[PDB]
Structure to design on (183 residues):
């Protein structure tokens, strides 16, 4: 109930659902760290453009 | 209104250089990728150069490629073209034309660029003095 109450004043993100275009490799130095646990390729870091009203 | 004024052009000789300055007013020049065009005696229009909103990329005709270099100045709200190795065939009136308004239109909805930039790649709506 308190979580819903704190959720109420938050602004909605419904218009964000439009289709976007993202790029995985970006202008940064490190992409493969010292450790590899099937997560270096799954970097979960992309930079993405999106239309907003 | 949105006005553009060219200057710096004058009589020159081949092999030298030239600085054509296109000042602008009446709008936010910080993101308006301008277009340098030329018109020779007894000839039609001929596109010279084009620069993006941010100056990242730029396009020059293969004939005029290398001889001219285009640049922008958002602080001055000005555009600049520096020549090099001028040729007698370059005799022309040079104009500085704007891009297709601020946003790009589609289905009555207008899109501005990143950081709300005035971008397009379309016809040239406004033309300068020359
Ligand atoms: C995420 O990864 C992606 C995948 O790599 C990134 O995207 C792009 O991928 C491409 C895959 O093929 C990469 O291609 C490589 O590009 C190499 C560099 O080529 C340029 O530089 C060499 C010199 O090192 C040059 O010989 C090449 O021709 C090219 O530059 C030339 O530059 C001149 C001068 O600026 C251009 O001349 C233009 O001429 C016209 C008139 O005709 C106007 O006057 C212009 O003003 C003028 O500039 C010339 O046109 C241009 N050449 C070409 C063909 O356009 C190359 O050596 C490799 O073999 C390979 O082809 C590409 O580099 C890569 N993008 C980047 C930015 O690296 C993606 O970018 C990345 N994500 C992020 C965020 O970066
Ligand atoms: C993913 O990111 C690239 C690179 O963007 C650059 O690096 C990021 C980490 C951020 O720091 C960005 O702020 C930064 O621009 C996007 O590609 C484009 O790269 C060019 C590099 O030549 C950027 O050019 C800049 O343009 C400004 C304004 O015109 C100039 O003042 C600068 O001097 C420089 O030339 C360009 O801005 C950048 N594009 C964008 C939209 O930021 C790539 O587009 C992006 N991926 C997606 C999907 O947008
Ligand atoms: C990455 O950082 C190293 C130093 O830690 C430096 O030598 C190298 O040039 C950097 N590479 C890039 C692409 O920034
Ligand atoms: C990285 O991968 C190799 C083989 O895929 C594995 O032997 C090694 O343990 C991995 N690195 C780590 C930190 O587990």
């Amino acid at each position: 109930s308190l979580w819903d109450q704190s959720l109420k004043p938050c602004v909605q993100l419904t218009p964000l659902c439009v289709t976007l275009d993202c790029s995985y490799n970006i202008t940064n130095n490190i992409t493969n760290s010292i450790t590899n646990s099937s997560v270096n390729m799954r970097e979960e870091i992309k930079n993405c453009s999106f239309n907003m009203t | 209104q949105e006005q553009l004024v060219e200057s710096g052009g004058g009589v020159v000789q081949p092999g030298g250089s030239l600085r054509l300055s296109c000042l602008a007013s009446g709008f936010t020049f910080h993101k308006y990728g301008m277009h340098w065009v030329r018109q020779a005696p007894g000839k039609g229009l001929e596109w010279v150069a084009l620069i993006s909103d941010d100056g990242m990329r730029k396009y020059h005709s293969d004939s005029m490629w290398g001889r001219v270099t285009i640049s922008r100045d958002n602080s001055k709200n000005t555009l600049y073209l520096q020549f090099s190795s001028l040729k007698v065939e370059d005799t022309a009136m040079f104009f500085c034309a704007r891009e297709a308004g601020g946003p790009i239109w589609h289905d009555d909805v207008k899109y501005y660029d990143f950081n709300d930039g005035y971008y397009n790649y379309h016809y040239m709506d406004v033309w300068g003095k020359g």
Summary: Strands of chain A lie at 21-23, 47-49. DSSP finds one helix and two strands in chain A.
